Amino acid sequence: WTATSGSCKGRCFELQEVGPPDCRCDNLCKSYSSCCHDFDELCLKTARGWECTKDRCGEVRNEENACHCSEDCLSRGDCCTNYQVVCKGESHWVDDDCEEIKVPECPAGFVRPPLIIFSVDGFRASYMKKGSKVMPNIEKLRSCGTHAPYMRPVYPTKTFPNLYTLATGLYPESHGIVGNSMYDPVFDASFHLRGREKFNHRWWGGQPLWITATKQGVRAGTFFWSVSIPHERRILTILQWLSLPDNERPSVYAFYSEQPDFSGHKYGPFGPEMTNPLREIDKTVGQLMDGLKQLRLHRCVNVIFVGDHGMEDVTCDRTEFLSNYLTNVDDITLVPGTLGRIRAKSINNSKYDPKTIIAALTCKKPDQHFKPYMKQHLPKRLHYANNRRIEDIHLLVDRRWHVARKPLDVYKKGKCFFQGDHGFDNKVNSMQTVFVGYGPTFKYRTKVPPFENIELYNVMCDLLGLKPAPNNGTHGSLNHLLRTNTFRPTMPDEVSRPNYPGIMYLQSEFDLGCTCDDKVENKLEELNKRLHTKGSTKERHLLYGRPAVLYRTSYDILYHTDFESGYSEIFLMPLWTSYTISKQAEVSSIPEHLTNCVRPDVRVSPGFSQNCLAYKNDKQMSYGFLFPPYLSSSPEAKYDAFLVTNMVPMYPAFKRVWAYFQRVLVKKYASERNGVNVISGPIFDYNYDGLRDTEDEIKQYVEGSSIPVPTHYYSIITSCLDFTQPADKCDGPLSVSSFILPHRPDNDESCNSSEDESKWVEELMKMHTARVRDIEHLTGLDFYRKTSRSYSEILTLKTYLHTYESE
Ligand SMILES: *[C@@H]1O[C@H](CO)[C@@H](O[C@@H]2O[C@H](CO)[C@@H](O[C@@H]3O[C@H](CO[C@H]4O[C@H](CO)[C@@H](O)[C@H](O[C@H]5O[C@H](CO)[C@@H](O)[C@H](O)[C@@H]5O[C@H]5O[C@H](CO)[C@@H](O)[C@H](O)[C@@H]5O)[C@@H]4O)[C@@H](O)[C@H](O[C@H]4O[C@H](CO)[C@@H](O)[C@H](O)[C@@H]4O[C@H]4O[C@H](CO)[C@@H](O)[C@H](O)[C@@H]4O)[C@@H]3O)[C@H](O)[C@H]2NC(C)=O)[C@H](O)[C@H]1NC(C)=O
Ligand SMILES: CC(C)(C)c1cc(Cl)c(C#N)cc1OCc1n[nH]c2ncccc12
Ligand SMILES: [Ca+2]
Ligand SMILES: [Ca+2]
Ligand SMILES: [Cl-]
Ligand code: NA
Ligand code: NA
Numbered sequence: 076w077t078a079t080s081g082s083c084k085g086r087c088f089e090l091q092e093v094g095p096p097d098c099r100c101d102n103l104c105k106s107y108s109s110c111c112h113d114f115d116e117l118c119l120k121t122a123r124g125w126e127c128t129k130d131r132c133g134e135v136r137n138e139e140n141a142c143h144c145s146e147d148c149l150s151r152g153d154c155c156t157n158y159q160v161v162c163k164g165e166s167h168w169v170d171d172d173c174e175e176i177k178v179p180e181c182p183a184g185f186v187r188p189p190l191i192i193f194s195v196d197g198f199r200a201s202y203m204k205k206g207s208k209v210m211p212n213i214e215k216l217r218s219c220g221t222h223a224p225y226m227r228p229v230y231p232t233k234t235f236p237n238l239y240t241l242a243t244g245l246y247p248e249s250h251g252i253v254g255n256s257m258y259d260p261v262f263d264a265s266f267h268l269r270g271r272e273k274f275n276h277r278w279w280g281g282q283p284l285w286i287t288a289t290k291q292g293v294r295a296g297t298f299f300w301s302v303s304i305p306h307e308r309r310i311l312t313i314l315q316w317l318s319l320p321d322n323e324r325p326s327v328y329a330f331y332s333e334q335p336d337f338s339g340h341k342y343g344p345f346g347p348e349m350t351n352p353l354r355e356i357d358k359t360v361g362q363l364m365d366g367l368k369q370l371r372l373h374r375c376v377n378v379i380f381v382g383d384h385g386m387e388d389v390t391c392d393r394t395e396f397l398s399n400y401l402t403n404v405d406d407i408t409l410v411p412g413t414l415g416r417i418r419a420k421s422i423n424n425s426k427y428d429p430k431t432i433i434a435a436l437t438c439k440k441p442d443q444h445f446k447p448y449m450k451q452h453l454p455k456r457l458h459y460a461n462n463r464r465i466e467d468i469h470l471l472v473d474r475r476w477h478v479a480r481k482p483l484d485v486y487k488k489g490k491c492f493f494q495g496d497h498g499f500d501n502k503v504n505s506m507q508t509v510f511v512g513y514g515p516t517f518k519y520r521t522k523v524p525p526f527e528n529i530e531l532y533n534v535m536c537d538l539l540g541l542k543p544a545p546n547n548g549t550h551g552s553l554n555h556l557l558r559t560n561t562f563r564p565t566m567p568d569e570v571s572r573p574n575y576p577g578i579m580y581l582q583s584e585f586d587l588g589c590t591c592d593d594k595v596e597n598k599l600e601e602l603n604k605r606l607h608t609k610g611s612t613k614e615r616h617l618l619y620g621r622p623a624v625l626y627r628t629s630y631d632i633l634y635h636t637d638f639e640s641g642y643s644e645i646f647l648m649p650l651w652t653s654y655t656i657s658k659q660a661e662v663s664s665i666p667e668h669l670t671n672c673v674r675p676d677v678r679v680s681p682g683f684s685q686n687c688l689a690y691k692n693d694k695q696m697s698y699g700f701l702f703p704p705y706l707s708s709s710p711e712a713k714y715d716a717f718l719v720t721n722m723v724p725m726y727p728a729f730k731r732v733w734a735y736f737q738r739v740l741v742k743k744y745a746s747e748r749n750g751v752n753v754i755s756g757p758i759f760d761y762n763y764d765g766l767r768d769t770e771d772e773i774k775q776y777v778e779g780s781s782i783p784v785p786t787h788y789y790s791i792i793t794s795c796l797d798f799t800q801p802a803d804k805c806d807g808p809l810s811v812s813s814f815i816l817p818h819r820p821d822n823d824e825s826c827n828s829s830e831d832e833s834k835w836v837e838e839l840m841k842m843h844t845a846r847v848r849d850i851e852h853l854t855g856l857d858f859y860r861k862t863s864r865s866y867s868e869i870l871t872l873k874t875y876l877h878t879y880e881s882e
């Protein structure tokens with residue numbers, strides 16, 4: 076209940092929320108059906124429109140007008156935004172030449188440059204270029220300020236997940252807004268676009284920027300605007316708040332436009348009808364900047380122009396129906412569209428089986444436009460699993476397509492309405508969105524590389540002098556956007572120092588069940604192999620320092636001619652293995668006599684070694700090697716590759732992937748990149764939280780042993796960004812690509828896996844591309860500790876994702 080017979084007189088767009096049943100005069104009142112009776116009359120005035128004209132100049136103040144052209148309007152803070160242009164001979168902001176803002180130029184009583192976030196729904200990255208002729212205000216922001224060619228959204232590429240990521244720095248799995256629609260089984264409650272449950276605070280995890288600000292003494296404007304408040308009134312309200320007294324005035328503000336998303340759904344991303352919404356958004360930007368200029372704030376305020384996601388061409392005819400695959404289609408609930416989420420219609424049905432649903436949806440039609448996954452098997456770059464609101468079964472839908480339960484869902488919701496949609500995999504080009512920063516704290520005329528929207532919360536906090544709440548950004552990775560206010564991070568401290576074992580065991584102390592045909596015998600070459608086991612080639616194979624171990628554990632550094640490793644006594648395998656392959660390196664085969672060779676490592680105790688008998692007796696599990704025997708520098712060096720300390724457990728199906736990567740792709744990348752340094756290793760993430768498992772979280776071991784089975788294998792492949800220099804003699808910036816491959820007992824994910832590895836393996840590896848940072852979270856390791864580069868630059872490198880999309 077609301078007692079709507081109080082009044083909004085002098086309270087219009089009040090910042091503090093008053094509690095029921097007292098009637099409200101803030102934005103949200105409309106969305107809650109709780110505004111006072113006179114809210115429209117007093118707070119939503121429209122009389123005479125939004126622009127001054129010559130005949131209104133110097134008018135007598137009429138309080139009914141939407142905005143004012145009277146002499147007193149500047150001091151009242153309520154002129155139409157074009158007032159000084161029409162009445163005082165001033166230029167529009169867009170007509171002024173760009174001049175570098177070297178320092179904030181703020182009115183007295185301004186303690187810090189304010190931040191205004193201008194968010195645009197569905198603003199696809201390529202609009203900046205393709206629409207530039209109709210968006211002069213936006214183009215001036217972009218060209219004069221700091222811009223990226225695009226910004227990567229989070230998955231799913233929907234509105235609420237991305238806007239709340241912008242506000243928190245968190246992945247959807249952590250903040251809780253995992254889609255525009257959700258069921259929470261602990262609450263037994265549903266979240267929808269329509270209606271009232273979406274306002275309950277239990278949906279919204281983390282700490283959004285407005286709360287971070289408020290807790291630290293910085294006042295915030297509203298972030299959520301009711302759909303019926305027109306854009307001109309949103310801008311006027313921001314400008315009015317900016318004229319408040321110092322003690323009352325917010326420092327952070329947000330504007331939101333429902334466009335161009337609204338029209339893009341109807342007409343497609345480049346429909347001819349899209350030109351007008353882009354014109355209109357630009358006009359609104361022009362109003363803001365003109366308004367700021369009137370207040371003498373245009374060289375004081377930092378402005379962020381940012382989108383939530385892009386838009387793709389999607390029509391009703393490109394719909395896959397689960398009714399064409401499953402017999403049991405009425406025993407499931409599907410969350411449909413540009414992603415699929417499946418759960419049981421009834422939790423009383425004990426004949427519901429996820430395995431049989433997945434199998435009925437796997438590779439059933441030759442041009443099938445979706446792929447089913449258990450959520451823990453989704454590419455780790457998506458970070459889309461660790462939330463009870465994300466259903467166990469997930470469908471990744473091909474760009475340009477939808478998935479639905481039955482045809483009737485599409486025509487009874489029989490002809491097609493829509494031509495655009497979004498929600499797809501966040502690496503897809505059409506889903507990419509925009510970032511522009513303009514103001515005293517941003518750089519002048521500066522282009523920066525594409526980056527992820529999870530990074531922006533930290534920067535917004537830096538722009539406002541706030542300490543960010545714990546989040547998924549990597550604070551410092553965006554310092555290159557900023558003139559000043561940089562955050563100066565330090566490297567994390569190493570927690571565990573390594574042991575450096577020498578030769579401590581005789582061959583006969585081992586009873587591992589391993590064989591090797593290696594009884595094959597010189598003081599020239601005897602001292603030389605000794606130097607290699609003490610680390611004489613380490614400078615070649617460990618280019619960026621050894622990774623630091625950031626948790627408590629017991630591990631050994633092991634040196635060899637061709638590779639170096641950090642060997643875990645707890646997990647009985649390397650945490651990491653590092654090696655460099657020059658452009659000139661040669662690929663050889665595993666000699667016939669060494670096919671089943673595994674050799675005891677006399678530096679490492681039997682008790683902390685793997686054994687071959689375990690693999691013999693585990694009928695499902697085989698083994699691979701981290702440093703590949705195929706890339707040995709010489710016949711004699713190859714024996715090192717067969718050490719028991721270089722062995723890792725591998726399903727035969729996965730060994731097909733791994734063998735092709737090692738035998739073919741590494742050498743290909745070395746030829747293309749002019750050498751590469753490779754770091755490879757295992758990952759254990761049995762609870763799919765994106766974070767390194769402790770020993771007691773491991774769910775699977777090689778049968779009859781304490782050898783833990785990795786969930787994933789990673790590689791980090793580094794070279795010189797200037798590819799005219801070899802990877803091992805690089806003077807400047809680095810270039811990286813990485814992956815986190817799921818360690819699966821089948822290749823069901825790859826529908827073409829019966830074919831030669833040259834037709835499917837690289838495609839798999841591209842799907843599972845990763846950031847170095849993702850591998851850091853999953854391993855508790857810290858890479859690139861010893862380079863010549865600035866730490867901020869290295870942080871940027873660690874956040875890079877190699878996407879494999881063209882332009
Ligand atoms: C991305 O960045 C984020 C933020 O940095 C990272 O998330 C953090 O990860 C930490 C480790 O997983 C985690 O720390 C835990 O916090 C517990 C207290 O949690 C509450 O308080 C915080 C602080 O205000 C709050 O933010 C939390 O909010 C979550 O939950 C509510 C709903 O309940 C949601 O509104 C919200 O969206 C959020 O949900 C997300 O996180 C939770 C986990 O907290 C997930 O379950 C959800 O699916 C969702 O992803 C909480 O309200 C604390 O109690 C934990 O302590 C246990 O573990 C320690 C280890 O040191 C152990 O010593 C203790 O014994 C203790 O164990 C006891 O509980 C166990 C489980 O009940 C039990 O088995 C034991 O036997 C013990 O009884 C733990 O420290 C931190 O909360 C989150 N923060 C957020 C915001 O998500 C994320 O990791 C980053 N991602 C990547 C990939 O890097
Ligand atoms: C989390 C939240 C959605 C409040 C949000 C976050 C940020 Cl960071 C911004 C910014 N800039 C805007 C935000 O909301 C804008 C908004 N208003 N009205 C809407 N209606 C439908 C959909 C979105 C909106
Ligand atoms: Ca949106
Ligand atoms: Ca884990
Ligand atoms: Cl109302
Ligand atoms: Na086996
Ligand atoms: Na297959």
Ligand SMILES: [Zn+2]
Pocket residue numbers: 197234336337340497
């Ligand atoms: Zn949309």
